[PDB]
Amino acid sequence: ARQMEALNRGLVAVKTDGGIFVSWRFLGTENASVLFNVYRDGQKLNAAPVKTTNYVDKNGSAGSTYTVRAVVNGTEQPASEKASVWAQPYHSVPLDKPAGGTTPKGESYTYSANDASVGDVDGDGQYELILKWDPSNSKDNSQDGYTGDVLIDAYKLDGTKLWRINLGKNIRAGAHYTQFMVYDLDGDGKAEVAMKTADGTKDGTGKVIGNANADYRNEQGRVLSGPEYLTVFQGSTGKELVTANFEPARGNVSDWGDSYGNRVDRFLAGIAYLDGQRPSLIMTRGYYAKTMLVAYNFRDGKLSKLWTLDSSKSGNEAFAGQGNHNLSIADVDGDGKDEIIFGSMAVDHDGKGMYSTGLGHGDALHTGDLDPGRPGLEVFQVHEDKNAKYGLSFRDAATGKILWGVYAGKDVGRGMAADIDPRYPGQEVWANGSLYSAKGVKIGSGVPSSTNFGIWWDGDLLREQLDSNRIDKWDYQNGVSKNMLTASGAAANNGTKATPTLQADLLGDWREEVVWRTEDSSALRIYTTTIPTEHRLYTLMHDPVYRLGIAWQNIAYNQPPHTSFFLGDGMAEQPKPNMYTP
Ligand SMILES: C[C@@H]1O[C@@H](O)[C@H](O)[C@H](O)[C@H]1O
Ligand SMILES: C[C@@H]1O[C@@H](O)[C@H](O)[C@H](O)[C@H]1O
Ligand SMILES: C[C@@H]1O[C@@H](O)[C@H](O)[C@H](O)[C@H]1O
Ligand SMILES: C[C@@H]1O[C@@H](O)[C@H](O)[C@H](O)[C@H]1O
Ligand SMILES: [Ca+2]
Ligand SMILES: [Ca+2]
Ligand SMILES: [Ca+2]
Ligand SMILES: [Ca+2]
Ligand SMILES: [Ca+2]
Ligand SMILES: [Ca+2]
Ligand SMILES: [Ca+2]
Ligand SMILES: [Ca+2]
Ligand SMILES: [Ca+2]
Ligand SMILES: [Ca+2]
DSSP: OEEOOOOOOOOEEEEETTEEEEEOOBOTTSOTTOEEEEEETTEEOOSSOBSSSEEEETTOOTTOEEEEEEEETTEEOOOOOOEEEESSSEEEEEOOOOOOEEOTTSOEEOEEEEEEEEEOSSSSSSOEEEEEEEETTOOOTTOOSOOOOOEEEEEOTTSOEEEEEEOOTTSOOSTTSOOOEEEOSSSSSSOEEEEEEOTTOBOTTSOBOSSTTOOOBOTTSOBOSSOOEEEEEETTTOOEEEEEEOSSOOOOGGGGTOSSSSGGGOEEEEEEOTTSSSOEEEEEEOOSSSOEEEEEEEETTEEEEEEEEETTSTTOGGGSSOOOSOOEEEOOSSSSSOEEEETTEEEOTTSOEEEEOSOOOOSOEEEEOOOTTSSSOEEEEEOOOTTSSOSEEEEETTTOOEEEEEOOSSOOOOEEEEOOOTTSSSOEEEETTEEEOTTSOBOSSOOOSOOSEEEOOSSSSSOEEEETTEEEEEETTTTEEEEEEEOTTEEOBSGGGOBOSEEEOOSSSSSOEEEEEETTSSEEEEEOOOOOOSOOOBOGGGSTTHHHHHHHTTSSSOOOOOOSSOOSTTOOOOOOOOEEOO
16 A cells, blocks of 8 residues: 545535535545535535535525535544635635846846645645746756746645745756655655755745855856755745755766756656655656666655666666656556656666667656556657657557557657547547547547647546646547637746646546636636536545656646546546555
């Protein structure tokens, strides 16, 4: 059994024209025989216990409050936490927008709300939002220039700002720099926050790490010298718990494949259950050429290093040049322990390189049960090298064997995987203007109008699409996308990537919520679906691959999360998660 979060009922109630829509979690600790009673202000609404974890109360009002009681072995359990009614289709979390600044070159910049993650920092079973702020002069690794400070905040859903960490002048702003992990690493029931830090990083209590005044910014506005640190911060306070020297260490900038400072600063990170029971922290560096991955534990108040994979070591040459601007984490070989899907290569739970497809770097990656007729997980990936044998590859996750691929002869920058067509079993995949079945059979002539995120939003087991401030649904019979939601007043992030601040099943039933910032970053808006469903599934945060996907969603070029099992049309009934909570 794996350590997973002790979650509350996640009860939510939302005003609609047809009454109050109520939804809640089916928890990983609950059996299939569990049913529910719904109460409005202490009065039961349903004559018989309901199975599905959504309910429409036609008689409810904006002033109503709700509780749910589980019915276990014929006996009603204590009431859930109380839920009030959302007067809007989204819940707003007001933000403390940081003031703008000026760089040493006299350039002004302002802040916008950017990537988020979630963790329960106080252990009450409700997630907090951990938000990264982005200065308007943040930089790709290919670009020279100074950047504003990167700020990381924690908010409760009620709008309480718990803390701000300022990573300081020695941490450059941009997609590929700070990769922040939020997770209960030590198993006490409370999340911590881990990331790369430097001299001058200021914790949530205002304490500066290392050499407070050291300035290692070069004239390119890059930080290519000086110490580098790894810090675990307390989730509730942002206080520094432990700081160690960061590995993978920089060495020489040129070790990584250029001298101007691009390849050296290509970071990814993850949470992986390397021991099959408890989480470990993964920090990576490099992917275009030299590539390193290091694993750590944070347990019993100590940070410990577990292993290193270094492509520059004799025997590891095949593990250079393969990584994406993203990764996945999953138990692919069935031993209960997590492996790392690092673009075109994979790394075992003990840090040993498993395989490389040799197809090289790409920009999108999907690891899940894509072909439910083929035992094991599958990885769908796209490839940037115009001379790659395949521009899109669909492989056995464990062995790396290519099941099918298609030559593109060009950079294929986007690819998606989602069950959008029930006429073909399993998840469809699309890239480079074509849609395919899980078996590689081209379907029709179109593709969905986005190739970004997949989201479970409506009531059916097919997956919808998310891009920018929109949720769309694929009309598979007619081969066209149609809009389901346009979140007016909400904005996506990261320029052409057009990503939400976060997509995750963070409250209510199994459908995924979306967190988008407002245009002016004065608030985050959490949208939860009010489309009824006949289906009950365990909260996705209790799935061992989905939960890990939420932890890495922020990293570099944000990718959508996947479940460890096939969730889609014609799916088998999912088994209870094998888990315990702290
Ligand atoms: C942009 C940058 O922001 C902070 O790190 C400090 O105020 C520093 O002096 C300034 O140069
Ligand atoms: C306010 C504080 O001032 C100095 O100690 C450093 O510049 C540090 O990075 C900054 O956070
Ligand atoms: C400006 C922005 O920066 C990063 O998020 C990505 O490179 C994206 O494609 C670009 O549009
Ligand atoms: C939309 C906007 O685009 C780019 O300029 C930056 O990457 C920023 O972080 C993002 O939110
Ligand atoms: Ca909490
Ligand atoms: Ca903890
Ligand atoms: Ca495994
Ligand atoms: Ca293994
Ligand atoms: Ca790329
Ligand atoms: Ca499979
Ligand atoms: Ca399908
Ligand atoms: Ca659906
Ligand atoms: Ca939900
Ligand atoms: Ca990102």
